[PDB]
Symmetry: C3
Subunit: 333 residues, 3 copies
């Protein structure tokens, strides 16, 4: 009886950060209340100043990571302000029924809706917008995110022993398809409706123009590099709502990886690289063992270093010369 369950209100935070939560459930099942406001906005996605009409949950690409426990109820108030011009909705891959909630959450500008669903399966899951007839346009305009449904007793390794993270980050990876003129320059439109049919032609080529983390080239670098310390246990949740990706921590590993993101399965150990299929969220657990800069990439290195799918960690601590050392620094023969 759902009336009788506790309610807790969660205030979301902007990726790659994750809202505060408990790994091990400190309460019984709850109705966990979220609100997201849909924002249609111009976003600059690259160093060149290329613009897209982005379609966002809560103003970000990706949408924020929501976190609950298995057999919690997720209750989302989804608001489509009258400053928007499109139809929106939401499909949670975590949910069961009505196209993941998409059939129940179609909101015109000036409308809102509240959906509740029971999070029966533990894992990380994609959520995305999916209005009938215009689904790939919405998703590849950035209107996707993820939800983590933790087991009530937290994550476990392949032996069933607890794995506890110190830090969690959420990397949303976005393929964009910016339409081009016949010379191959990107096009600009006053409104999203004007972009749409050219958007469909660009998507049908299947090759992205850009592939970015956290909504832009370089978003997770510099002052916005991810951070950790030697000895810290870090979970990286990574989603890709539309295309395969192959994440790799350059300088590290995934010590435990749920490549297709579902925590009732034992993790894969010691991964160099893993395949997160388009329409999936995955999670990798790593304990840093060396300080310094790491590149976290889609290991199609073209996608990473030419199209945008690369971020950095800056890791503090002491250097372990037993794990790695320069015996002879680069020098002339």
């Amino acid at each position: 009886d759902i009336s009788t369950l506790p309610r807790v209100k969660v205030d979301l935070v902007k990726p790659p950060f994750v809202h505060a939560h408990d790994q091990v459930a400190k309460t019984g099942p709850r109705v966990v209340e979220f609100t997201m406001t849909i924002e249609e906005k111009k976003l600059v996605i690259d160093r060149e100043g290329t613009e897209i009409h982005a379609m966002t949950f809560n103003g970000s690409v990706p949408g924020p990571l929501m976190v609950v426990h298995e057999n919690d109820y997720v209750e989302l108030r989804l608001i489509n302000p009258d400053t928007n011009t499109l139809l929106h909705n939401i499909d949670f891959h975590a949910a069961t029924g009505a196209l993941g909630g998409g059939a129940l959450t179609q909101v015109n500008p000036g409308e809102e809706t509240t959906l509740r669903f029971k999070a029966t399966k533990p894992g990380v899951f994609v959520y995305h917008c999916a209005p009938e007839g215009m689904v790939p346009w919405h998703v590849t305009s950035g209107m996707n995110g993820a939800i983590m449904v933790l087991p009530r007793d937290g994550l476990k390794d392949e032996k069933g022993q607890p794995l506890t993270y110190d830090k969690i980050y959420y990397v949303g990876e976005q393929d964009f398809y910016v339409p081009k003129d016949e010379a191959g320059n990107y096009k600009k439109y006053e409104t999203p409706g004007e972009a749409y049919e050219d958007a469909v032609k660009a998507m049908r080529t299947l090759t992205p123009t850009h592939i970015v983390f956290n909504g832009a080239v370089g978003a997770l670098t510099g002052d916005h590099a991810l951070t950790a310390a030697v000895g810290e246990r870090v979970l990286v949740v990574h989603s890709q709502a539309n295309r395969d990706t192959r994440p790799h921590l350059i300088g590290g590993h995934g010590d435990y990886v749920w490549a297709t993101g579902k925590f009732r399965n034992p993790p894969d150990l010691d991964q160099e690289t893993w395949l997160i299929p388009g329409g999936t969220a995955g999670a990798a657990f790593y304990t840093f063992r060396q300080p310094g800069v790491y590149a976290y990439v889609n290991h199609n290195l073209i996608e990473a270093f030419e199209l945008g799918a690369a971020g950095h960690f800056k890791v503090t601590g002491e250097w372990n010369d037993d794990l790695m050392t320069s015996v002879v620094k680069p020098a002339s023969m």
Copy 2:
């Protein structure tokens, strides 16, 4: 001694349906006899009336699902009628030796052949045509299907307990590469031989023009939507003989998934989406928990909703408001 084994003749059925079989073997090992007639035919693959010279086993794209048990013998009579104009053969991924049988089954028009092989490994497997020098043209002209080799004691979960399906469907997913003129319109040819070299150029671009289930855009929708009831256990076998796919049941999950299709492995649980590599068949088991329409897709949503890789389930039964409910239907603020 094979003479002494029972023979059973199977009459195949058109995908997405599957011929009658027993999950748990009710006999000892058998020689299971199949006949397929090769048909070269014009097929309309999209709503626009785009045509291809399709190359089929038994008149369908995909070819029918064959079902046997482990350590049965598959005996296929493969007929190339004199109304055809090409060389054909068959490679079973389930089989061992002679390029999966391809080296033994090359039939000119007006020829037939009978191949026998022992199905030593349980799983779902691709079969396809593969004539030396022209293999991708044949496969991507639709000449592929799948065979399921069930364990003799039926499917098992990750704990080794029986999993019994009520219903099984076979989704064959086909990438087509229809040649284009310089404006990007699809080309038509009187005969397959006239299409061939332009076919090779179109394939070499690597990007499909169409990606369809059951041989056409919309084939598994409307009167040909897949069906189930709440509480029904359904196995969806999915193959892709040439390219990766990432199936997703929109509104559901794969409760147990053999993404790369081999039943001696424990299934992956609770999948949102899974990666079936090109040249593979996979299988997902799901118990429906909600009525209504589901979209079963390749979750590159461009491939699904622009190129054709989307089908529907229509599911009957009562709606469970505990699993999902609209708290506040879409309404003005």
Copy 3:
């Protein structure tokens, strides 16, 4: 204390062959010493005589397979002769820290360096060149290979029982992006620096012009076909530093497969085809059961048979008619 450990010097061999090693470690942990000389060279990659400025470790594409045991120390002397014109370095995916060693191994022509790292994780791993700002160009010019870190007690099956191979081969699969003129003919440059910017445009299309095993179309065929005998246990290590692949032994299987290459995980059994993500090495174990020619392919059959990703095994021994036989050879009706 590393001074006190044994040192062993390994002399590498050209792929697809693998240097001599012990599967089960016959010594305690060692510093295993390797030397590689970087060679920039013109390579003809196809039957048409298409040329690329290849960037190699030790003169080969791929670079040689290095083999050590877990908790050995790998010590690589990497030499950039003054006959080269580019900056090079090396990222070992097996290693921990400093971008896999890339941050410590940047050598100008006329320089060398020696890196040591502890091989803490067992598996097969990609290594590649990765100079900051030019990483995908180097990798897709062929400057990648793999390292196998065997468990000290050798490989184990899914039950933890020994798996011992008779033969090991290393297939490096290389996506190349040869720039084209406007008619689609490949371009030639006097020097690598002249190719670079056109190389970047070609890579950004994301679709390879060629995809080859062992550095060229047809490299593992004819006199250079891989070989085995019926009853022989063969491990095929396969890497792809930049794009997904889907290996398949046509006529066979992967009896035990580590698709993402990490030996602390149980292998997947009875695979027809497996997904090795770009930036990964994988390994498949197979016991041949039939003689004859096998095609070992990337099972995007376009990539295999049009772009180059196909090799052969020639297998000797007797034919098993119980596993497969022609009942009726192709003949007229």
